Symmetry: C2
Subunit: 406 residues, 2 copies
C-alpha cells in the first residue's frame, strides 16, 4: 500500500551525457543520429545509429570495469549520476538489505559472445578467451556488474523484455516497494551499440535504409515515408523510493508513479496487435483520477508499429487525445535502455514544463489525423504524463507518472 | 494476502524427459552426465556435460519453432507438460489477462549470436543471417517465444540472474499472485547446451576437468576431490496458482509456496560471500512455523562454493541441520534452468516421500562434518522442503515449499 516516487535520475544517451545536455536537446529538437562507418563496413543496408558521444575510457575503476560490457558501463555511469542526483551517501544505500537493484538489457552482449567464440577458434584457444567474458556476455550482466561494486544487499536481478525491458524493471521496482520489501530500488538498463546485434535487425528488415545520406532525417515517427527504426544505445537509471522514506530524508521528488501496466498480445511475434496495448494503457490508468496531459509514445518509426499504437491511443482516449510526441525521432531506438530513458525524458518535461517536439514529420500519416501530435517545442504546465513501451514477442509496458502535490 | 500453490509441473533434463523418468532417476541415484565430443573438439579441457537425451525434431509446429533457440524449445516442451499436468484447458488459460508467463535463461543464445555474426561476415551477408535470429538471440527469447503461441495475455517478461534465474522467476510469479494481479503464472526457464557458452566457463576455470574419462563421477558435490561443476541444459516449468482459484477447479496441489528469499552479496563477482546466503535462507523461513525436513542445496561441486554454502547452513540451522543432498551430482549444473528443475526435484520428493541421494562422495570434505548429508535413497515423510540457488554476481534465491494440509 506504499506510495512510490522517483527521487533521482541518471542518463547517457545519443542526445546527451547527463540530464542537462538531454534537456537542451529535447527543447531544441536536436537529433542524436549520425552516420556509422562501422555499420556500413559490416555489410548492412542501414548505416545510421543513435550513438553515445562519450569516451568512457578511464571513467570506471580498472578492477570494476574488467568485468563489464558496454551496456553495463552505460548503466554504471547512469547509476553514479542517479546517486548524486538523489542525494544519497554510501552509508545510506550500501550494505543495506532494504536497497536493491533491478536493471537489464535486451540483448546482453552480442559483441562479447562473438569475441569469445572467435578467440576460442583461434590458435590461442581458452587463453585468448580470458576469464571475464562470462560476466560480459551473460544476460544478467547489467545487474550483476552494478550490484557488486555498489555493495547492494537487497534484490538483485535483471528483467528482459526486448523494447519494454527497462520499463518493466521500473514497474517491478515499484512492486517491491508496494510489497514492503525494499525502501529504495535502483531501476533502469543499458544497451551496447554494435554491428553484431544490429545486423540481426537489418536481416529482419526492421531498420531504416533510405536515409543513410541524411542521418538526421532517418528516424521520422508518423511521417508517411518512414521505413523502420534507427538503432541506438546508452543507459538510464532512476531511483525508485518509498514516499515516507523519501520525505523523511528531504529528497527532491520528481514525480510519483501512479500507474503501471504490463500485458501481453499473445498474437504476433514481431508486430503489435494493438489490443494488448489498449489493455496495457487502461491498466496503467486504473485509479488515476487526473487526465493524461502528455503521452511519450513508443513510436519507433516503422510502417506498421506507429499506426497500431495510434489506433490503440484512439481506442483508449477517444476524443480526449492527450498531447503526443515520439522522442525516438530525435534519439533513435535504444531497445533495452528505451524504457528508462523515455521515462527520464518525460520526467524532465514534467519538471520543466514543456513538451518536446515530434520531429521530421514532413507529411503526416493519414491515420494520425485528429490526434494532438506536437511538432514544435511548446511550454505547458504538465501534471500527469504517460510513457509506452511495446516490445517484440508482444510484451507491453506503460508507466504513468504524476507531480506530487508540491 | 493470497496464498500460492503449485498445481502442475513439466521438465526436460539430463536425467529424464518427463516427471516419471526424473523420479526413477532420482530414486536410483542415476547420473545424467556423459562425455561430449562437441566440447572436446572445441578445444575445451572439460569434456563432460549434462545433456538432454531427446530429439526435439518435429515436436513443435514449424511456424512456431522457426523463432526458437534450444532454451525456448526446452521451456516450450516443459510448459506443454505442465499444462497437461495442471489439468488446464485452452479456454481457461488462453486470451486471459489474469494468466501470465515469467521465464528466462541465464545466457540467452550464444549459439545464435555467433551464428548470426558468422553468417554476416560470409559472402552472403544479411541473406545468410535471415529474419529469425533476433527472437533466437535476444535475452527474453524464452518468454517471448512461449507467450505468443500459448496466447498469454497477462504479464510476459524474462528474469535473468545466472544460476538463480528460474528460482527468481518462480518467486516473482508468487508476488504477482500475492499482489492480486494474476490468478495463474507459468514460471520457469530453459538453457541451451553448447560449446559457445561452455568455453566461457572453462576459460574462467569453473568446470570440472579431471574426470573426463569417467563422466559419471565428475560432478561430486561435497567430495574432497571435486574440481568444478559439470555444465548442463534443459528446461522446467511450474504452474503457480492462487489457492482459491486452484481449489475451485479441483486442481491437484503439490505444495504451497510458504517462503521466498531474494538477496544480494554485494561482495564478490564470482564467489559467494556466504553472508548473503544466510540472509536469503532466513528471509525465506520468515513466518514458516514448521521445521525444514529437507534442503536441496545449490551445491555445484566447486571447491569454494560447496563450502561457503555449508557454512551458511550451519549458521542458519545450527544443530537442527535438516537432511541435505545435492542433486547436481546426478544432473550437472543447468544454469538458468537449475532453479525450476531443482524445485521440481524437491516437489517430487515431497510428493513421493523420499530423499534423493547426494552421490559420488568418496571422501567427505571436512567442513561437511556433522551435517546430515544423505548419501543413499531414504524413504521418509517430508512436510517442508527448501531449495537454494546462488548465482554469479552474488544474487541469491531460496524457495520454501510445504504440503498443503491434504
Amino acid at each position: 500500500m506504499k506510495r512510490v516516487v522517483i527521487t533521482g535520475l541518471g542518463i547517457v544517451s545519443s542526445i546527451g551525457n547527463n540530464q542537462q545536455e538531454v534537456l537542451a536537446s529535447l527543447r531544441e529538437g536536436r537529433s542524436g543520429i549520425t552516420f556509422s562507418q562501422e555499420l556500413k563496413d559490416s555489410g548492412m543496408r542501414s548505416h545510421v545509429w543513435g550513438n553515445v558521444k562519450l569516451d568512457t575510457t578511464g571513467l570506471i575503476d580498472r578492477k570494476v570495469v574488467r568485468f563489464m560490457s558496454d551496456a553495463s558501463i552505460y548503466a554504471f555511469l547512469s547509476m553514479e549520476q542517479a546517486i548524486a542526483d538523489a542525494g544519497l551517501s554510501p552509508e545510506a544505500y550500501q550494505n543495506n538489505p532494504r536497497v536493491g537493484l533491478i536493471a537489464g538489457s535486451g540483448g546482453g552482449s552480442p559483441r562479447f559472445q562473438v569475441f569469445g567464440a572467435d578467440a576460442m577458434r583461434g590458435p590461442r584457444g581458452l587463453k585468448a578467451v580470458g576469464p571475464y567474458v562470462v560476466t560480459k556476455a551473460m544476460a544478467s550482466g547489467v545487474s550483476a556488474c552494478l550490484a557488486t561494486p555498489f555493495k547492494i544487499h537487497g534484490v538483485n536481478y535483471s528483467i528482459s523484455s526486448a523494447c519494454a525491458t527497462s520499463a518493466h524493471c521500473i514497474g517491478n521496482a515499484v512492486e517491491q516497494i508496494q510489497l514492503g520489501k525494499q525502501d529504495i530500488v535502483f531501476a533502469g538498463g543499458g544497451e551496447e551499440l554494435c554491428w553484431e546485434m544490429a545486423c540481426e535487425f537489418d536481416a529482419m528488415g526492421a531498420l531504416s535504409t533510405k536515409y543513410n545520406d541524411t542521418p538526421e532525417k532517418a528516424s521520422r515517427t508518423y511521417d508517411a515515408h518512414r521505413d523502420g527504426f534507427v538503432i541506438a544505445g546508452g543507459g538510464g537509471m532512476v531511483v525508485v523510493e518509498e514516499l515516507e522514506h523519501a520525505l523523511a530524508r528531504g529528497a527532491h521528488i520528481y514525480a510519483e508513479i501512479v500507474g503501471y501496466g504490463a500485458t501481453s498480445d499473445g498474437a504476433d511475434m514481431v508486430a503489435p496487435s494493438g489490443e494488448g496495448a489498449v489493455r496495457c494503457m487502461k491498466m496503467a490508468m486504473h485509479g488515476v483520477d487526473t487526465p493524461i496531459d502528455y503521452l511519450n509514445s513508443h513510436g519507433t518509426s516503422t510502417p506498421v508499429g506507429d499506426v497500431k499504437e495510434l489506433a490503440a491511443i484512439r481506442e483508449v482516449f477517444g476524443d480526449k487525445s492527450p498531447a503526443i510526441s515520439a522522442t525516438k525521432a530525435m534519439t533513435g531506438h535504444s531497445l533495452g535502455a528505451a524504457g528508462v530513458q523515455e521515462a527520464i525524458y518525460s520526467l524532465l518535461m514534467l519538471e520543466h514544463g514543456f513538451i518536446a517536439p515530434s520531429i521530421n514529420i514532413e507529411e503526416l500519416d493519414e491515420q494520425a489525423a485528429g490526434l494532438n501530435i506536437v511538432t514544435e517545442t511548446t511550454d505547458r504546465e504538465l501534471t500527469t504524463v504517460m510513457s509506452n513501451s511495446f516490445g517484440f514477442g508482444g510484451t507491453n509496458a506503460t508507466l504513468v507518472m504524476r507531480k506530487l502535490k508540491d
